[PDB]
Symmetry: D2
Subunit: 414 residues, 4 copies
């Protein structure tokens, strides 16, 4: 079966999926090869991903390869209901995903997905893999391998590995060059601001925007906020990215100092409770807070709800918390990934490369079944580099190649 909002949205979803595919030519080439070679014949697969037009294009590629897939939502607010209807109605792919589903429904979907007995699990944040290892030790025989889309999931998998429970291969998709160099940086940079503007309509120019974290995502968000005229503050816990932020022209300071100054706060750390009650207490009246790291827990919304004497929905995706002293704190997207909650996530141009990595990582797991050591595996260099070559070609860009004399010069030392 399936569990979706409205099957009648399938014609609209089909339209949106085809529009998204215009900038996914690398994944389109992979799909056409998969249709011929059927690498996933007889394989059962579970994908826990954001249910978007880009994920649909990945799901259709795995379907073309013969995979018996089941899809569930990575996050209650990121699901595109028209996409879910199209995958069920047009491709017969079971989808368990409703935009705005409660937590009980989400956990039921994880159980149904584990009952599919997947051989391959594509995960985004590692929730299904963690639940497999904790609750379904008796199913581990099914597992050929798993993949992990995002930085937060990679951290979880390392914790699993160090705990001695990562007893199967897991492909580190996030850390492929063609994933986090583009998706995490340029994709998040544009789509995070997109979500903020779609939720609030606010002018970014002249605002002070605080970016917590200066890794791949933070560099992108700060870069684009600056491009839109914002005064950017960066917070960090490590000195190397902190120095980078300073030399990129941004003001670096502890969050306690930034909390007095920000008009908009954006967390992209992958860590818990980066913005806390002692920070809410000193924020400007009407300060906006939002999260672009995989889990909402980066903002301590639980404490904010306790502190506040009133909460009201002021707009789509926008809630106003009123503190007992009468000052307000505006939260976008209930603290969930603001690019996917309030807009449509990354453009398909960067998801082409992220999901090419997903598709070829799944092919890698099956082709090498019985030959991969348990634990985390990076994407093979040849795969990573071929995705880049294909994407640069599809963007219409030509570059140079080394001559035999230049190759001789590199290998020379005298």
């Amino acid at each position: 079966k399936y569990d979706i909002k409205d099957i009648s949205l399938a014609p609209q979803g089909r339209q949106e999926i085809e529009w998204a595919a215009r900038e996914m030519p690398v994944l389109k080439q992979i799909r056409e090869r998969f249709a011929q070679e059927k690498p996933f014949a007889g394989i059962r697969l579970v994908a826990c991903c954001h249910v978007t037009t880009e994920t649909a294009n990945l799901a259709i590629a795995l379907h073309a390869g013969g995979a018996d897939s089941l899809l569930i939502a990575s996050n209650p607010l990121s699901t595109q209901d028209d996409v879910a209807a199209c995958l069920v109605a047009d491709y017969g792919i079971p989808v368990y995903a409703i935009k705005g589903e409660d937590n009980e429904t989400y956990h039921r979907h994880v159980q149904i997905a584990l009952d599919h007995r997947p051989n391959i699990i594509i995960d985004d944040g590692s929730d299904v893999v963690a639940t497999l290892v904790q609750e379904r030790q008796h199913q581990l025989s099914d597992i050929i391998g798993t993949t992990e889309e995002t930085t937060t999931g990679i951290v979880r998998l390392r914790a699993m590995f160090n705990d001695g429970v990562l007893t199967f291969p897991a492909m580190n998709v996030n850390d492929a060059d063609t994933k986090h160099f583009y998706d995490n940086r340029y994709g998040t940079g544009q789509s995070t601001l997109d979500g903020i503007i779609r939720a609030t309509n606010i002018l970014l120019a002249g605002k002070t925007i605080v970016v917590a974290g200066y890794g791949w995502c933070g560099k992108g968000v700060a870069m684009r906020a600056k491009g839109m005229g914002a005064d950017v503050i960066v917070t960090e816990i490590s000195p190397v990215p902190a120095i980078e932020a300073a030399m990129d022209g941004f003001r670096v300071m502890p969050m306690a100092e930034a909390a007095h100054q920000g008009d908009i706060f954006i967390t992209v750390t992958g860590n818990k409770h980066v913005i806390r009650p002692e920070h809410f207490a000193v924020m400007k009246d009407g300060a906006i807070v939002c999260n672009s790291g995989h889990f909402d827990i980066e903002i301590d919304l639980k404490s904010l709800k306790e502190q506040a004497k009133e909460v009201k929905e002021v707009r789509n995706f926008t809630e106003q918390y009123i503190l007992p002293n009468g000052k307000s704190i505006i939260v976008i997207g209930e603290g969930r990934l603001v690019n996917l909650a309030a807009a449509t996530g990354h453009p398909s141009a960067v998801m082409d490369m992220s999901f090419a990595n997903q598709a070829l990582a799944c092919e890698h797991l099956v082709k090498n079944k019985g030959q991969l050591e348990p634990g985390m595996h990076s994407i093979p260099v040849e795969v990573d580099q071929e995705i880049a070559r294909l994407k640069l070609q599809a963007m219409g860009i030509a570059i140079d190649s080394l001559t035999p004399e230049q190759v001789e010069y590199i290998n020379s030392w005298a």
Copy 2:
């Protein structure tokens, strides 16, 4: 009465109007003085504006001042139907404006507006003022003055003046410092890209974006396109702004040369047929064209429709024209103002200053009734500067002031 889509949308419109008001503190101060002083007591007023949350806040301010106002849509795609509902149901202000109305409905609304016998007309593009002068010479005895919001309207007013038919005062709101330095540049820069992204979800980074025109709007569009990672080309007809664009790091070239290279074309010239049939024929497969100047005629869409063998709707706000050779041209928003057709227009932060100028220009017209010469009047300097002082204060920014000795130094030449 009125002519709107659905009066049941009024509670939603009220919520949106109040959200937009948060960054209109200057206009709010004017509203509060107007409610005390009633400068528009006994005055009938027509406003032909984009029916947005920002225009609503202007209409409420004129209402507090005593104006007997009637509002019609400047453009069929920019009307926000919940705003129209709120103005009718909560303020008793007649609104003739339905999103998506046809051309005949629009011209019927203009005739209704003129039958209101306004003493003051606020216009955006000067269509109502042109109709008044053309068809209603007998009504000119009613006119205390008019105002004009946008650059294309100022150009039409100059042509009316030179034709000898501008026989009343017209306030040049567009060219106030606190209007086109901010609205036209920073407002359009953000909101134009907002409309493109809401229509297409396209990644701007890595695209070649052609901006036609490097005036106030084109400077803003190019600045923010560059900030979002695009490769920017600028076209021009005048050498001073062309040199500026070169020294700002942009490529400058004729549109015939840009036509082969652009991925996204954005017209902001105020002129007719800037993108032409001979340009469509050489564009890249899947090039996107859109317009952010007041009238759609900047793109020769009539010719495009005759060159195309087929037109498809690919998603909201987006049409795909397929040429006989199979290549596609994408049009956003039917060539209408892309920021207002596909998104919500400028943020309220800059419309605060634009519409503070409108309200104070109307006050200037009434206080000086029977004393102003016919023709175009600029916004008085003391007014323009007071809007800037109030806005800067409302942004929480403090600056310096000259000491008495520094003042003496300025007036010393020895």
Copy 3:
């Protein structure tokens, strides 16, 4: 005769003058017409300019036109001694200008210039014109007109006008579009940072740089400081440019608040005592202060010297003032124009347009002798626009032109 450092430097000066001429093609075209038409036959001329390779190219053009010219230094630190040598030895043009000359030498040079009995005076800062009006009322019968290169000179001329003593025509070269849109903004933006880096070798990335003033020069300085990775603070006295700086992404605040934070301070206001004793006392240990407005009095160096217990020369163009608490304040170029004191001033590409305006303004004065009203005259629009057309062509940039139907559309209001 002349008064220069070393005439043996002439071959070196000739080489530098010819290098600078490569990006002065507009002025070269004017020189070639002048040599045919001789507009300055029988005219005596004084030029008080920065004695640079660019001024040399201007002097050569006036010479080709027949001018009996005499050149003196506008500023003791900006004189290039090899340029002075070449103008004397190769062109027989009297030059009174020695790099590093003392104040008494400068004032002696002004007296020599006035004894030349000029009919035309080109001034930069209006010092010679003020001396002429103040001391030489009997010579005013010689004057056909004067010109003024820089913003501070225009301000002094306005004060002369309002005092009733501007009894001849003065051409406002600074405010020509092709002057202060390019020279003042992009020229100063690059050359000011050039002077700072040549004086100090300091990394700009990661520094907080305070720019006093956000007019044409301050916009350029802030733009390029930001481009080099600095955190930029802007101070102002007027709200319109303050809002601009905020929407350009810069922090705006009073200088008293900036004084605690800046690593490098750059004054470009045209006003007196913008950096003050109460600012020195709170600056960071090792803060650098410099001036890029025409006169050094923008920084209160007199007070700094009295607050300091000791001053050391730390390298060329750089002085270290040590305060009693042991903290240091670094002054570049003794507070004189840092681009011209520590480097070579604006690139010749923008001086081409500035000094094309000078040459054509002198021609305008002579062709209209005995016909111009006393007071300030702007550069004629046809002149300003022709300079822009020639410069754009010389940069190899082609743009569009309106078709006949597009022209008709502009003049249509119906």
Copy 4:
């Protein structure tokens, strides 16, 4: 003994060395510890480095640690003669380095340095290490280890390793986070443009600048050229950095296409013959070419000299080659590292971290003598991270630290 230009320059060199040390506080702390602990007592050391004020501060730190050092120039045009005089006269350190020395003198200095019988070799480009391994196999017993400052040297060392001749430990200083993230990127970005401007005085705004290579140095040069208003073209041989360049807003193309368009060409590839005769032949008349990669061979100057019918020195650091068809090619710095040839190299702020890595890498080699495997060693993470911590502290920047609960969250997976 020693071999320098002029011992009388020592007072000026002392001044310049002290000025440079103001932004080298990390290396100053290392020097003070070294003065106490004497890690290099009884050690002989050779450094082949650019003989700059920053290298002098490193040499003084090694001297404080008890090292018996000898310094030679890495490059004939980068030597600062006043620094060389100060090291000889004030510290008794043998320096063999004359700015502008011929190739025969440079090779003699390498022989004298090898006759010092070093135990530690600090190299920049690996020339001395290669000569040791090729010519002095009988001295390898002396060697505790070597270090390598730059990317080109690292490539050479890998070639040595793969050839089986890297029979001792070599510290990869270049690839430390606190080296190539800042030095190669932000340092080269500023100092390369500094050198171009000091040599030519050219306005960068409005020029087309071609950057060959988009690694750490290329990203910096392109970023700063764009910050100065240039239209930037990037050439590459690999698709990952090529896609990055596009998404950063730059035009990516093969060098054969860029050769027609560039006004200024900058090579930062580390490879041979990136700009070739077939490229010179299509360049604009007056195109400027320069190199910022360690060796000049990135530009085929040998072929340019053969093709040209004439060469003349048009300015300091600037040569004009005239081709038989009369077009000119301008070369800066004889194709040598333009930041060091025409200016003073990187600011001391970034060399503080690069040379902290050098100093602590030398301490690491001695502390671990007899315990390091032959081959290339990366800088230990704890050393790399401590340099960053110390530099961030000295820049006056404070950041956050993880709470115990955040640490628990990272190590958790369920």
